[PDB]
Every structure is written in structure tokens, then in C-alpha cells.
Amino acid sequence: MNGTEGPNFYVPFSNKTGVVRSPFEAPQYYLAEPWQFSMLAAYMFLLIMLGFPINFLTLYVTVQHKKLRTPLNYILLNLAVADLFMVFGGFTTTLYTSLHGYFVFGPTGCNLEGFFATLGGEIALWSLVVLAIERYVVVCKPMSNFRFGENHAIMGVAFTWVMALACAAPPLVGWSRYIPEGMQCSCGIDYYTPHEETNNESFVIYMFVVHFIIPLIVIFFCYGQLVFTVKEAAAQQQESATTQKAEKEVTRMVIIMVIAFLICWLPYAGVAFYIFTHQGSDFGPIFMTIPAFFAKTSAVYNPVIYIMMNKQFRNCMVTTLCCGKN
Amino acid sequence: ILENLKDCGLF
Ligand SMILES: *[C@@H]1O[C@H](CO)[C@@H](O[C@@H]2O[C@H](CO)[C@@H](O[C@@H]3O[C@H](CO)[C@@H](O)[C@H](O[C@H]4O[C@H](CO)[C@@H](O)[C@H](O)[C@@H]4O)[C@@H]3O)[C@H](O)[C@H]2NC(C)=O)[C@H](O)[C@H]1NC(C)=O
Ligand SMILES: *[C@@H]1O[C@H](CO)[C@@H](O[C@@H]2O[C@H](CO)[C@@H](O)[C@H](O)[C@H]2NC(C)=O)[C@H](O)[C@H]1NC(C)=O
Ligand SMILES: CCCCCCCCO[C@@H]1O[C@H](CO)[C@@H](O)[C@H](O)[C@H]1O
Ligand SMILES: CCCCCCCCO[C@@H]1O[C@H](CO)[C@@H](O)[C@H](O)[C@H]1O
Ligand SMILES: CCCCCCCCO[C@@H]1O[C@H](CO)[C@@H](O)[C@H](O)[C@H]1O
Ligand SMILES: *C(=O)CCCCCCCCCCCCCCC
Ligand SMILES: *C(=O)CCCCCCCCCCCCCCC
């Protein structure tokens, strides 16, 4: 007996002292110091300060730089938009709830928040995949005489959106569900309560297989092929210093992107998988945030990786930020 | 493929 169940929540603290209140009614200061709530607040503040600009600036720049509006860039835009759902849907909310010490918006708030929060994350995630697929297609030319254009880019994006809804929407309608997670200030997919009227158990498998293993296998194969396609092209062009560099640089970028994709979702997956194998074993309200911490903060490093290091976007940002040019 | 790499933001 480690949790306190409630009609709409799971407080990861034991009400044997009779102090646990609904995380929708009263501050959860008994499962974590008020200060740690502020630290939470602090971090949400950080993610908003950094996250908002980087992601907003991305869109903003695209509206102002013809060259950025190529269709091979849509998925990146998509990414930023997704990060923005994460900012306004997730971060700001939490910053706000965290400062009350509980989820002041109640069940439906939980649902809204959880939905937009997870929607964005999923979109972003699936973009990273879609992006991989596209580069694979474009660079490894696996298709006879195919040429990537606006329509693909569009589908590519639409797909992202679908996949996201394919995961965030079910909870809203009874396959799993959104409950206050961690310190009860943000809302998430219930992946740790065997709560059965919703079938969390299966859903989590669906999540784990479809929204983590598929992506991982696809992203791995794609960039694998790419880093092979480029490594090979260089071995066949050892005379061309650039091709050499390009190979070197693309490899480095892939290692970054992959390691980054892992840092972002491994935690969630790893934890989910553990919890799904080690039953009744309690997990603290803070430990339940570690995974969230890595995922949410991606809304900053993804744009750093996929946008700020992308040479064009960067030059554009610099130009814009410095009024004149470089 | 430098061209396609520069198209993908990769190079
Ligand atoms: C965590 O543990 C605590 C303790 O188990 C728990 O809080 C308790 O909840 C009950 C309600 O479910 C609270 O009881 C109320 O108690 C007051 C006493 O001041 C009663 O007067 C209320 O009402 C009754 O009698 C009326 C007759 O006029 C009836 O019309 C009415 O329907 C009621 O029967 C009511 O019983 C109790 O005070 C708290 N205890 C504490 C210490 O807060 C809490 O809910 C648990 N957390 C979770 C998430 O479950
Ligand atoms: C409450 O949480 C603790 C985790 O700290 C659970 O404890 C363990 O209990 C299970 C027994 O089924 C064993 O597999 C582990 O060896 C125990 N670990 C430790 C460190 O004691 C506990 O099961 C949870 N709930 C209850 C009712 O005990
Ligand atoms: C009583 C005032 C506390 C100030 C010391 C901060 C301790 C920093 O360490 C904290 O200690 C907590 C104990 O409450 C642990 O639960 C936390 O996991 C840990 O982050
Ligand atoms: C962006 C900053 C948002 C401001 C958040 C303020 C949250 C208020 O927080 C609440 O205020 C009550 C005072 O009536 C206290 O009694 C509660 O204990 C406290 O949790
Ligand atoms: C899943 C995506 C692939 C991960 C990165 C591919 C491995 C990059 O590692 C590369 O391996 C080469 C061996 O051929 C070495 O010669 C290079 O020094 C090294 O950059
Ligand atoms: C056009 O050239 C105008 C831009 C040049 C001014 C750059 C000044 C840098 C300010 C950095 C902001 C740091 C503050 C973050 C903490 C609130
Ligand atoms: C044009 O004149 C340049 C102004 C651009 C201002 C952007 C600087 C933002 C400040 C954030 C600090 C970056 C920390 C990096 C960690 C290594």
C-alpha cells in the first residue's frame, strides 16, 4: 500500500497518515516539500523562457525568409509547433499549477492539459521520425526516380498529426486516461496504474510498441542507411574534401540526433517497461518526474539540434536577431 | 550528395 487511489487520480504517497488530498482539491505538500514545488516551478519557467523563443523564433524566421519555406523544412516547422503545444499546453500550465502545489484545474483541466501536452510531444516525436524517413528517401534514394515535393512534406506532416492523435486521443475516450502524474502538478498518460476500466495495461503496450519501438526502429534504420549512404559516397570520392567533411559531419549529426532521441524517450519507455514488470512496487512522486523531465526539456534541445544547428535556419535567426545581417 | 545533404539541413 504505497499509493492513494481516487476517482480520478493516483497520489504516489500513502494515505495511512490520512494526509493525502485529491491533487485536484488541495496542495500535495505531503509528497514533496513546497520548495521542491518551486524548483519544479523554476524548471517550468526555464523551459518556457528557452522553449518559447527558440520555437517561436523558428516559425517567425520562416515567415520572413523565403529560402526556409522549402517543403523539406515543413516537418521542422511542424516540430516547433509541437514544441509550442508543449510550452503553452504543458509548461505554462504546470508553472501555474506547481505554484499552487496541486492541479488547480481539476479533471477536465487535467484532460485538456494532458491531451495538448501529450499531443505536442507525440507530434514532435513523430516529426523526428518523419524527418528521418524523408532524409532517408531524399539522400539514400531508395526509390526509383522519386522526387520529394510539397505534397509529400504535407502528407509527412499530416501523418505526424495522425500518429499523435492516435495516442493522445484514446485517453480522452477511455483507453488509458489522463491523471495528474509525478508531484500531481502536470497531467500525463496513466501508464503505471493497472486501472482497468480504461485498460492502461494494453494501451501502454500499444504505446511502447507503436510509439517507441516503431519510431526507434524507423529512425535507426533510416539514419543507419543515411550514414551508410554517406560513408560510402565518401569512400568513392576520397578526392573531394567536402564529401569527406560532409560524411564526417553527417555522422556526427546522426549520433547526436539518435542519442538525443534516446535521451528523450528511453526514460519514459524504460520506466514504463519496469513498472509494467515490477508490480505493486511503489515509485515516488519525484522519480515519476525524472522521465517527464527528460521528455519535456526536449522542447528546447530538439529545436537546438534540428533547427539551430541546421545551417539555414541558424543564419536566418542570426540575421533576424541582429536586425541587419551577420 | 552534398546537394541533397544541404537540402536536408544535414550539411
Ligand atoms: C486520505 O485520508 C483521509 C482520512 O481517511 C481522508 O479524509 C477524510 O474524508 C472524509 C470524507 O470522505 C472526511 O469526513 C467528513 O468528515 C466530517 C467530519 O468533520 C463529517 O461531518 C462529514 O460528514 C457526515 O455526516 C453527515 C450527517 O450530517 C452526512 O450527511 C455526510 O454525508 C457525512 O456522512 C464527512 O464524513 C474526513 O474529515 C477526512 N479526514 C481528514 C483527516 O481529512 C481523505 O479523503 C483521504 N484521501 C483520499 C484521496 O481519499
Ligand atoms: C510498496 O513499495 C515497495 C517498494 O519499495 C514494495 O516493496 C518490495 O516488496 C516486494 C514484495 O512483493 C518485493 O518484490 C521487493 O523485494 C520489496 N523491496 C523492498 C526494497 O522492500 C511493496 O511491495 C509496495 N507495496 C506493498 C504493499 O508492499
Ligand atoms: C528541511 C529543509 C530541507 C533543506 C535541505 C534540502 C535537501 C536536498 O535534498 C532533498 O532532500 C529531500 C528530503 O526532504 C529528498 O526527499 C529529496 O529527494 C532531495 O532532493
Ligand atoms: C504565473 C504565476 C501565477 C500565480 C500563482 C498563484 C497561486 C496561488 O497559490 C495559492 O494561493 C492561496 C492564497 O489564496 C493559498 O492559500 C494556497 O495555499 C496557494 O497554494
Ligand atoms: C543508427 C545510426 C548509426 C549511428 C552512427 C553510425 C556509426 C558512426 O561511427 C563511425 O563508424 C565508422 C566505421 O565505419 C568509423 O570509421 C568512424 O570513425 C565513426 O564516425
Ligand atoms: C539587433 O542587432 C539587436 C540585437 C542585439 C542585442 C543583443 C543583446 C543580447 C541580450 C541577451 C538576453 C539575455 C537575457 C536573458 C535573461 C532574461
Ligand atoms: C545579434 O546581434 C545577436 C543577439 C542574439 C541574442 C541571443 C542570445 C540569447 C542568450 C542565451 C544564452 C545562451 C547560453 C548558451 C549555453 C552555452
- In a mutational test of the B interface, the residue from A65, A135, A147, A228 whose CB has the highest number of chain B CBs within 10 Å is A135
CA dist A205 and A203 (Å) reads 5
Q: Domains in chain A, start-ordered, CATH in brackets?
A: 1-326 (1.20.1070.10)
Per residue in A181-218, is it b (16+ CB within 10 Å) or e — as a string? bbbbbbbbbbbbbeeeebbbeebbebbbeebbeebbeb
Q: Is B3 on the interface with A (CB under 8 A)?
A: no
Rg (CA), chain B: 5
Q: Is there a contact between A305 and A260 (Cβ–Cβ < 8 Å)? A: yes
Nearest alpha carbon to residue A295 among A161, A171, A182, A174: A182
Residues 6+ apart with CB under 8 A from B8: A72, A134, A135, A138, A139
Give the C-alpha distances (Å, rounded to integers) separating A283 from A5, A138, A182.
Answer: 14, 44, 9
Beta carbon of A1 within 6 Å of any ligand 2 atom: yes
Q: Is there a contact between A23 and A31 (Cβ–Cβ < 8 Å)? A: no
Beta carbon of A321 within 6 Å of any ligand 6 atom: yes
Judging contacts by C-beta atoms under 8 Å, the chain A residues touching residue B1 are 139, 229-230, 233, 243, 246
Structure obtained using: X-ray
